[PDB]
Amino acid sequence: PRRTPQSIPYQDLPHLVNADGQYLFCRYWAPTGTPKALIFVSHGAGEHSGRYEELARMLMGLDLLVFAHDHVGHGQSEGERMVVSDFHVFVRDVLQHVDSMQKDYPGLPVFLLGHSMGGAIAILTAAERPGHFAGMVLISPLVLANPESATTFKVLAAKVLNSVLPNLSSGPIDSSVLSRNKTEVDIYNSDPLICRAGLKVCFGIQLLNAVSRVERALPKLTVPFLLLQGSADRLCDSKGAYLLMELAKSQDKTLKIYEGAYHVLHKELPEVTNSVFHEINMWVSQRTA
Numbered sequence: 396p397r398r399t400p401q402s403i404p405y406q407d408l409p410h411l412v413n414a415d416g417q418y419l420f421c422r423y424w425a426p427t428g429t430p431k432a433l434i435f436v437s438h439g440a441g442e443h444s445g446r447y448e449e450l451a452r453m454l455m456g457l458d459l460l461v462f463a464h465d466h467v468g469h470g471q472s473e474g475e476r477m478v479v480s481d482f483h484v485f486v487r488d489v490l491q492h493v494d495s496m497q498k499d500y501p502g503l504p505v506f507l508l509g510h511s512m513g514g515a516i517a518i519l520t521a522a523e524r525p526g527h528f529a530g531m532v533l534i535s536p537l538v539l540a541n542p543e544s545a546t547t548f549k550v551l552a553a554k555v556l557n558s559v560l561p562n563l564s565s566g567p568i569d570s571s572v573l574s575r576n577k578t579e580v581d582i583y584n585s586d587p588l589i590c591r592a593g594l595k596v597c598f599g600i601q602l603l604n605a606v607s608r609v610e611r612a613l614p615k616l617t618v619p620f621l622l623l624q625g626s627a628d629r630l631c632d633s634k635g636a637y638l639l640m641e642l643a644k645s646q647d648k649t650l651k652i653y654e655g656a657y658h659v660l661h662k663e664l665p666e667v668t669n670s671v672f673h674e675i676n677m678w679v680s681q682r683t684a
């Protein structure tokens with residue numbers, strides 16, 4: 396039997412099989428009655444769909460059907476950890492899941508919610524189906540990386556690829572600089588479904604591809620969106636949030652900046668997280684009435 400990386404059979408779990416034959420672990424939060432809309436939650440690099448439990452519960456409380464999967468190489472899905480043949484795999488697999496749910500809830504609007512790399516995936520998914528999605532909620536989306544970090548990575552990648560230097564990595568995710576909430580940092584660090592390994596050069600190249608593709612997509616974007624961004628984001632530079640506001644053609648676009656907040660706004664200090672939940676609730680409520 397095909398099993399998760401934790402050895403649990405997929406036959407016992409909600410799942411899908413992607414176009415490459417890989418099992419992806421799925422998660423669903425359905426309201427008791429007819430949903431008003433569907434919303435797909437797109438997690439980021441190194442994490443998984445279970446990080447979004449409370450936000451998903453809030454959205455299902457608004458009578459949306461919330462759905463997600465662990466991207467290939469993440470969480471309880473198959474694949475070598477935190478690698479991908481090409482970044483578009485993630486987009487393709489989101490569209491598979493979206494298409495399979497929409498046909499069983501025909502006529503319902505579909506939203507996207509994404510954080511960080513998951514926000515890049517949401518942008519590229521909406522740009523691939525222009526006019527299709529009802530709206531997108533973006534939490535610190537990967538639009539422009541920290542320029543020092545990105546430069547460092549490009550230099551390292553050239554040494555590995557071009558000068559064949561072995562076993563080099565620019566390092567693992569450092570959660571301590573991604574939230575000011577120390578309790579959330581500790582919870583993340585001990586989550587058994589995250590990836591704590593050093594960044595592989597092949598995956599960093601796909602993240603660079605993502606940023607390049609997002610840049611080309613921004614003028615095609617017409618989807619309504621809410622963009623939430625912290626001013627002290629060490630990973631997704633706030634300049635990218637301003638770029639997205641400027642270059643998207645969407646007629647319905649809103650930015651909220653959280654002064655002093657770090658990258659993971661939905662796992663930040665309680666005043667920030669509570670605001671993030673409130674703002675998402677009101678934005679989605681107003682667009683699902």
Ligand SMILES: O=C(c1nccs1)N1CCN([C@@H]2CC(=O)N(c3cccc(-c4ccccc4Cl)c3)C2)CC1
Nearest residue numbers: 439440511512567568570574579580583594659662
């Ligand atoms: O919940 C948490 C908490 N932190 C503190 C408290 S809670 N999170 C979940 C969300 N991640 C985001 C999601 C995402 O796409 N990220 C991402 C994006 C681009 C690059 C890299 C990267 C950087 C270096 C090495 C390897 C890699 Cl891959 C990571 C990190 C952060 C931690």
Ligand SMILES: [Cl-]
Nearest residue numbers: 482483486519
């Ligand atoms: Cl892509």
